[PDB]
């Protein structure tokens, strides 16, 4: 089996310079290459390239080979693996579960027994079967150490089989025990009929005569590639040997990047640049490069197939492992539960604090304090929600970002896992609150009274959640979403409900803005439910309820069924507005 | 190889060769017994071990480590026993990561330090002179005159900044100048350079100490005095250029084409992974340890092979230092405008009293209660968030010592003042417009001086929290709840006669409530008001009658007062961590 990986040219470009030019590579089974390049290497780029996850940003006109044969943009996520150098994992699974959802989202057969075959299988190779069943955690002493991580992230491709694994820096964060342990374990992957490509910044010097193929890139141009041995007599019939007590990486590394901090060093260092790049397209070494890939391709001796093996699951299985996925990241997590259901009951503690009881009495703040509870209630319900997203989403985000081009799922399959599992806590947590303070504030009785207001006040805490999720879904930073979402319901009940300014004798605008914030219909029933039934006593203009809900949303009681329907209608909207603005977030 | 051009010397150390010798130290969190002697002239860069207590080792020998205390030992300084004296008297610490200000040039971050740092004694062309001879020393005479600009992004580059930061140390000519990974993110081509214009310093008659994980196999070829570690014990100590030797000679030679350095740290690494893998190292590394100090215990060293700037001198220099810069930052300043001017016209549309129906009375209140009550979404949080960008910059300068919280809190409050009242402008006049209230020009500035009042009571409310609690969303939290307060107890959205006796002397000092008092004390004083009535018993319905308005603004500045008081016994005494 000469199973082989090729590149018969390369090139790249954005706009509107150029990145890689005439890349041209070839491993084999077996062997674990190394990428050396300075910043501006395109190294990073090269890797993507190949993994095909730059997709039609620029201009790619290289052919990617496997197996003798050629491939299409479209397999090339169908055959190779790739991990970033900075693994995102869910914090509240253990190694087990980590590599038990990941084994779920993967294949598409059945028998789950075999699937505890196969997620005990990848943590023996990666000496994690140690450590699984164990919760992932935190930093070195209280979690999981830092090469487990790095363990975990392999161990999660592994489950799929991919024949070819392109790794990016992996022992940039790591020590020199650990960084060198995953160098180790790197070269044992190889050699197992895997090919094995990785970058690496300050390669230390034991690791030079461990990698098969050694190649350099600076500014897009292949400078080398070979062997360590066929290296180190390149350079020295180029005229450059290594000095006695030199790291050969360090050395040829800064022998073939362009100093910069001059024009005639920048002129200089290029043109000693040009020379041996040029030197190495004329090499015995390089031309044995191109006279090998199409070798393979007109060698009928093993054509294959592309790997990783396309069995998906449907939408609605897929679901049910994030949601499942996620909620046990939640509740396992006993911190945020706790914030996420009783954040409300603290803002309503808090003005309760404030006004004990509501007083009938139209002198002593009969409907000024009346006024007041509802406006905070309106306008503080959607800031809460909100503040439950930008804690707790933008790190299952990350996990998202990481799966959706790896082909777990789509980003906005994890919206919709998200958006169902905060439903039984924001639910629970609005009752928590209203069955506490309703009574206390001693609004009004009846027990159909309390019933309405609890279910008035759920939906602006799940609108204010949902809506926050669109926008993270665009907007990156969490603490600018935070200041956005917040000017908006400020915006929203300031606006939309009658209260601080009577909707009917302001300007034509802010009446038309109102017919679209949520505010105004959850005040319009808000303002009925307490004002209804009530009756005064004592300047003192109003006597019975029944005459403020004239004053202001006027009408509103006839309105009662819509403005509920109206109210609770957002939901389904900014989920399914969600689901097109992730789809969005896939291209950027 | 790299590159060669002028190594002539510009700025030299004009004094003895002053010295630092430790015998004996152990600490521990750290490290367990080391002894040497340096002298200025030579540069000794320390190996050792990955963040393996001695990142934390120029902390403790200059006695401002934390994490531990120092367990035996002595410091020598000069011959004298360690103490922070000697320490800001003597050692010049280059922080790895320091911030200076983004919108001045290399000069003026210089010249600014430098009119803090040099002797008052000194004419402005000595001083002068000094910032200009560090400059040309650091290879600075090209670029001197660019912005240091860092998320400014364009300016100068990472090797230039650190030049820069080097620069900062070096205006008041130390003798013994130590740098923590002087070579952190820098280019390889930068990094050699920089470290032969360290080279160069050393040679200026000062004693130049390193702290340095992995350098590459050009740089070690650049080493004098070197000290290799494993962890709390040292190693081996001496010449750079025989480090092969004196490890050929005792039995763990060093391989060909391998850098020295990085093949000897991991010649002494001790694991944690396995109890008996850490338990054979450590082994390994006092036993290696016990074999030098001997091998150099019958040999010395250990070695193989001003009346200052005042208090208002400094408010002056800081003030202009602060104020240079945020005003360069065009930006900032063109945002934090829209964000005024679109909102004083999102709330004088809403009661936009002209061209329709005149302003409800109750539409009036809410007008001004919300004027005031809704500045500090803004000035709450930007305020904390200036604070909390300067903390990096803040810490240092206060520690080193260049200043007093005295000078800086005069600084603090005054430099924003210049900015402040513009942000007023565009937010209380527009609403005042468009809304249509009271007419005349008296009116018109009672009101935008109490909104400026209640504004600047919030700044220092706000600039107080940030330098009294550790982090910033616990700042941002406590503001908020008292903002929060701060706007129930206001008395808008609740009755202040029905307020619990809490949240009645809450209101007693809440600025929210004085704001919304006094502005429904300015449209209502006199006037008689269209339904006409006269304002007064309007506003005593409303029990905004006692307290006359002039009260209302010497509250407000009491509370801005007090609130002043918070802010500089927060400075002096809670020190202010950077993140
Ligand atoms: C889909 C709905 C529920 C989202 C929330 C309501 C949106 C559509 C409404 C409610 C309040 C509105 C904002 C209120 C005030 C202004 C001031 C104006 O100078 C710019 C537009 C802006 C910022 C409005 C944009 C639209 C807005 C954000």
């Given at each position: 089996e000469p199973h082989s990986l090729g590149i018969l040219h390369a090139s790249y470009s954005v706009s509107t310079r150029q990145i890689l030019k005439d890349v041209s590579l070839y491993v084999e089974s077996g062997q674990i290459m190394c990428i050396l390049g300075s910043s501006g290497s395109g190294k990073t780029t090269l890797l993507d390239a190949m993994?095909?996850?730059?997709?039609?940003?620029?201009?790619?006109?290289?052919?990617?080979?496997?197996?003798?044969?050629?491939?299409?943009?479209?397999?090339?996520?169908?055959?190779?693996?790739?991990?970033?150098?900075?693994?995102?994992?869910?914090?509240?699974?253990?190694?087990?579960?980590?590599?038990?959802y990941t084994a779920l989202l993967a294949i598409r057969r059945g028998n789950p027994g075999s699937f505890q075959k196969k997620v005990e299988a990848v943590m023996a190779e990666l000496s994690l079967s140690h450590v699984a069943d164990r919760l992932i955690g935190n930093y070195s002493l209280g979690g999981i150490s830092t090469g487990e991580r790095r363990r975990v992230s392999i161990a999660a491709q592994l489950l799929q089989d991919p024949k070819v694994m392109l790794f990016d820096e992996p022992t940039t964060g790591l020590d020199c025990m650990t960084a060198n342990q995953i160098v180790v374990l790197l070269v044992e992957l190889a050699r197992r009929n895997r090919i094995v490509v990785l970058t690496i910044h300050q390669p230390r010097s034991e690791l030079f005569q461990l990698f098969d193929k050694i190649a350099i890139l600076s500014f897009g141009e292949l400078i080398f590639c070979g062997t360590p041995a066929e290296m180190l007599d390149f350079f020295n019939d180029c005229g450059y040997p290594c000095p006695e007590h030199s790291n050969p990486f360090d050395f040829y590394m800064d022998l073939t990047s362009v100093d910069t901090q001059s024009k005639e060093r920048e002129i200089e260092?290029?043109?000693?640049?040009?020379?041996?790049?040029?030197?190495?397209?004329?090499?015995?070494?390089?031309?044995?490069?191109?006279?090998?890939?199409?070798?393979?391709?007109?060698?009928?001796?093993?054509?294959?197939?592309?790997?990783?093996?396309?069995?998906?699951?449907?939408?609605?299985?897929?679901?049910?492992?994030?949601?499942?996925?996620?909620?046990?990241?939640?509740?396992?997590?006993?911190?945020?539960?706790?914030?996420?259901?009783?954040?409300?009951?603290?803002?309503?503690?808090?003005?309760?604090?404030?006004?004990?009881?509501?007083?009938?009495?139209?002198?002593?703040?009969?409907?000024?304090?009346?006024?007041?509870?509802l406006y905070q209630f309106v306008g503080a319900t959607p800031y809460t929600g909100m503040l439950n997203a930008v804690n707790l989403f933008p790190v299952l985000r990350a996990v998202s970002d990481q799966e959706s081009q790896d082909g777990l799922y789509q980003k906005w399959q994890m919206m919709l896992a998200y958006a169902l599992h905060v439903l039984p806590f924001s639910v629970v947590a609005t009752m928590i609150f209203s069955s506490v303070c309703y009574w206390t504030l001693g609004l009004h009785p009846e027990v159909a009274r309390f019933g309405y207001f609890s279910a008035a006040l759920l939906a602006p805490h799940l609108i204010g959640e949902f809506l926050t999720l669109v926008l993270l879904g665009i907007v990156q930073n969490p603490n600018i979403v935070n200041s956005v979402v917040a000017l908006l319901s400020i915006a929203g009940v300031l606006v939309g409900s009658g209260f601080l300014r009577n909707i009917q004798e302001m300007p034509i605008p802010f009446?038309?803005?109102?017919?679209?914030?949520?505010?105004?219909?959850?005040?319009?029933?808000?303002?009925?439910?307490?004002?209804?039934?009530?009756?005064?006593?004592?300047?003192?203009?109003?006597?019975?309820?029944?005459?403020?809900?004239?004053?202001?949303?006027?009408?509103?009681?006839?309105?009662?069924?819509?403005?509920?329907?109206?109210?609770?209608?957002?939901?389904?909207?900014?989920?399914?507005?969600?689901?097109?603005?992730?789809?969005?977030?896939?291209?950027? | 190889f790299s590159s060669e051009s002028d190594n002539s010397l510009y700025f030299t150390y004009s004094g003895q060769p002053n010295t630092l010798e430790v015998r004996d130290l152990n600490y521990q969190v750290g490290i367990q017994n080391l002894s040497f002697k340096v002298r200025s002239g030579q540069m000794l860069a320390i190996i050792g071990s990955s963040g393996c207590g001695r990142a934390s080792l120029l902390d403790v020998i200059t006695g401002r480590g934390h994490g531990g205390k120092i367990k035996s030992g002595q410091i020598w300084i000069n011959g004298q026993p360690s103490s922070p004296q000697l320490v800001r008297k003597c050692v010049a610490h280059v922080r790895q990561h320091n911030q200076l200000l983004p919108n001045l040039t290399v000069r003026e971050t210089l010249a600014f330090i430098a009119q803090m740092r040099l002797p008052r004694t000194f004419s402005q062309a000595q001083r002068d002179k000094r910032v200009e001879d560090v400059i040309a020393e650091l290879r600075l005479r090209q670029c001197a005159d660019t912005?240091?600009?860092?998320?400014?992004?364009?300016?100068?580059?990472?090797?230039?900044?650190?030049?820069?930061?080097?620069?900062?140390?070096?205006?008041?000519?130390?003798?013994?100048?130590?740098?923590?990974?002087?070579?952190?993110?820098?280019?390889?081509?930068?990094?050699?350079?920089?470290?032969?214009?360290?080279?160069?310093?050393?040679?200026?008659?000062?004693?130049?100490?390193?702290?340095?994980?992995?350098?590459?196999?050009?740089?070690?070829?650049?080493?004098?005095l070197v000290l290799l570690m494993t962890s709390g014990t040292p190693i081996y100590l001496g010449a750079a250029q025989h480090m092969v030797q004196y490890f050929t000679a005792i039995g763990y030679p060093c391989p060909r084409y391998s850098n020295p350095a990085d093949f000897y740290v991991d010649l002494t690494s001790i694991d944690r992974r396995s109890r008996e893998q850490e338990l054979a190292t450590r082994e390994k590394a006092?036993?290696?340890?016990?074999?030098?100090?001997?091998?150099?215990?019958?040999?010395?060293?250990?070695?193989?092979?001003?009346?200052?700037?005042?208090?208002?001198?400094?408010?002056?220099?800081?003030?202009?230092?602060?104020?240079?810069?945020?005003?360069?930052?065009?930006?900032?300043?063109?945002?934090?405008?829209?964000?005024?001017?679109?909102?004083?016209?999102?709330?004088?549309?809403?009661?936009?009293?002209?061209?329709?129906?005149?302003?409800?009375?109750?539409?009036?209140?809410?007008?001004?209660?919300?004027?005031?009550?809704?500045?500090?979404?803004?000035?709450?949080?930007?305020?904390?968030?200036?604070?909390?960008?300067?903390?990096?910059?803040?810490?240092?300068?206060?520690?080193?010592?260049?200043?007093?919280?005295?000078?800086?809190?005069?600084?603090?409050?005054?430099?924003?003042?210049?900015?402040?009242?513009?942000?007023?402008?565009?937010?209380?006049?527009?609403?005042?417009?468009?809304?249509?209230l009271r007419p005349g020009l008296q009116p018109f500035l009672l009101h935008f001086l109490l909104v400026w009042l209640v504004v600047f009571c919030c700044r220092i409310m706000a600039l107080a929290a940030a330098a009294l609690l550790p982090t910033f969303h616990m700042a941002s939290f406590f503001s908020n709840a008292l903002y929060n307060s701060f706007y129930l107890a206001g008395g808008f959205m609740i009755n202040l006669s029905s307020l619990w006796t809490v949240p009645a002397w809450i209101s007693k000092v809440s600025f929210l409530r004085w704001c919304f008092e006094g502005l429904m004390k300015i449209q209502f004083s006199r006037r008689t008001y269209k339904m006409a009535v006269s304002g007064d018993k309007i506003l005593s319905v409303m029990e905004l009658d006692s307290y006359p308005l002039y009260a209302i603004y010497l509250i407000v500045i009491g509370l801005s007062g007090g609130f002043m008081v918070l802010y500089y016994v927060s400075l002096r005494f809670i020190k202010q961590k950077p993140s």
């Open positions: 993994s095909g996850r730059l997709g039609r940003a620029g201009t790619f006109l290289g052919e990617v080979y496997v197996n003798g044969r050629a491939l299409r943009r479209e397999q090339f996520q169908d055959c190779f693996s790739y991990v970033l150098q900075s693994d995102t994992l869910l914090s509240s699974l253990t190694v087990r579960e980590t590599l038990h260092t290029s043109k000693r640049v040009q020379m041996i790049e040029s030197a190495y397209k004329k090499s015995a070494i390089c031309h044995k490069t191109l006279k090998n890939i199409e070798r393979m391709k007109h060698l009928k001796t093993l054509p294959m197939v592309p790997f990783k093996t396309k069995d998906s699951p449907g939408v609605f299985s897929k679901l049910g492992v994030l949601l499942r996925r996620v909620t046990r990241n939640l509740v396992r997590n006993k911190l945020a539960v706790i914030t996420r259901l009783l954040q409300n009951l603290i803002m309503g503690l808090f003005l309760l604090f404030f006004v004990l009881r509501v007083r009938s009495n139209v002198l002593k703040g009969a409907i000024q304090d009346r006024v007041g509870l009446k038309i803005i109102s017919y679209f914030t949520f505010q105004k219909y959850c005040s319009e029933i808000l303002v009925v439910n307490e004002f209804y039934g009530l009756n005064f006593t004592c300047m003192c203009a109003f006597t019975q309820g029944i005459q403020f809900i004239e004053k202001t949303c006027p009408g509103a009681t006839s309105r009662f069924t819509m403005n509920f329907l109206i109210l609770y209608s957002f939901i389904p909207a900014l989920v399914i507005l969600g689901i097109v603005v992730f789809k969005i977030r896939d291209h950027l | 912005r240091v600009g860092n998320m400014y992004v364009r300016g100068l580059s990472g090797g230039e900044r650190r030049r820069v930061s080097i620069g900062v140390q070096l205006l008041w000519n130390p003798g013994i100048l130590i740098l923590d990974e002087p070579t952190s993110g820098l280019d390889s081509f930068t990094a050699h350079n920089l470290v032969k214009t360290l080279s160069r310093l050393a040679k200026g008659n000062r004693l130049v100490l390193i702290s340095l994980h992995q350098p590459r196999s050009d740089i070690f070829r650049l080493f004098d006092q036993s290696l340890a016990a074999l030098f100090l001997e091998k150099v215990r019958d040999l010395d060293d250990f070695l193989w092979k001003t009346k200052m700037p005042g208090a208002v001198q400094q408010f002056t220099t800081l003030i202009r230092r602060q104020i240079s810069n945020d005003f360069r930052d065009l930006p900032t300043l063109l945002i934090h405008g829209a964000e005024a001017c679109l909102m004083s016209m999102t709330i004088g549309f809403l009661y936009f009293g002209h061209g329709s129906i005149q302003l409800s009375f109750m539409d009036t209140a809410a007008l001004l209660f919300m004027i005031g009550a809704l500045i500090p979404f803004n000035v709450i949080l930007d305020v904390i968030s200036k604070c909390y960008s300067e903390r990096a910059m803040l810490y240092y300068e206060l520690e080193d010592g260049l200043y007093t919280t005295g000078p800086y809190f005069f600084a603090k409050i005054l430099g924003e003042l210049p900015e402040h009242c513009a942000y007023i402008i565009i937010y209380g006049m527009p609403t005042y417009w468009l809304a249509n």
